[PDB]
Structure 1
Amino acid sequence: NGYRGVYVIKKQLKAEYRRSLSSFFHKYGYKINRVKKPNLRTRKAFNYVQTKDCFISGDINNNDLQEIRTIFDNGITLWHTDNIGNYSVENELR
């Protein structure tokens, strides 16, 4: 029946789950779980950012500074174009 040698079978998830996960990643990026400085303006259209216990300093009354930490700890989307909310765009790097 012609079975000899070695076979390489390549597999990927179904269309339904590709659509599902791709759309989630497009809007909310990836799970990172790193302590590092955040990516604020690396994409052409928008950057989603969610931190935990973030550190932010500056010449700011601590009250406003605390509010700002809270904002990033809750997650926020930073837009780099005037078309705010339009997620159809590619949102490629740079």
Structure 2
Amino acid sequence: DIAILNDYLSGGNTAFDYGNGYRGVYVIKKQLKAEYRRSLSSFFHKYGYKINRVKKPNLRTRKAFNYVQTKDCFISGDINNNDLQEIRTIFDNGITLWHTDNIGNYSVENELR
């Protein structure tokens, strides 16, 4: 509101806002600090993302390596049951499958296949 100069005259600061240039709407984009970007990005690079889906696992979808960790995984095959049980345990514990000969070199991009 602006003051009305009549006999009745004698709230809020419209001048402060307008005079300091605040009008309309503002879009402010915000992102986590470099320290945490480094932390989290390096972790996702090595261990992928939390998934929480029942599905067939991504075994060979990246160029250099795939991390796989299941829970109660289902695996079948014409294999003695002792070895099948050991294999299921391996994936339930988490394993990195390497598709390159440079095993262990995490500096690579590991882009999608």
Bin the TM-score by the shorter chain: over 0.9
Count of aligned residue pairs for this structure pair: 94
CA distance in 2, matches of 1:76, 1:53: 15
- 1:7 is the counterpart of 2:26: yes
Q: Which structure: greater strand fraction?
A: 2
RMSD of equivalent CA atoms: 0.2
Q: Deviations over 1:7-57 (max 9, x none)?
A: 000000000000000000000000000000000000000000000000000
Structure 1, unaligned runs of 5 or more: none
List, as ranges, runs of 4+ consecutive aligned residues in structure 1 with deviation greater than 6 Å: none
Q: CA deviation at 1:70?
A: 0.1
User: In the alignment, what sits opposite 1:93?
Assistant: 112
Query: 3-state SS of the aligned residue for 2:27?
Result: coil
Q: CA deviation at 1:63?
A: 0.3
Q: CA deviation at 1:92?
A: 0.2
CA distance in 2, matches of 1:42, 1:36: 14
- TM-score, length of structure 2 as denominator length: 0.83
Structure 2, unaligned runs of 5 or more: 1-19
Greater length-normalized contact order (CA 8 Å, ≥ 6 residues apart): 1
User: In the alignment, what sits opposite 2:6?
Assistant: none
Larger radius of gyration: 2
- TM-score, length of structure 1 as denominator length: 1.00
Q: Report sequence identity in percent.
A: 100
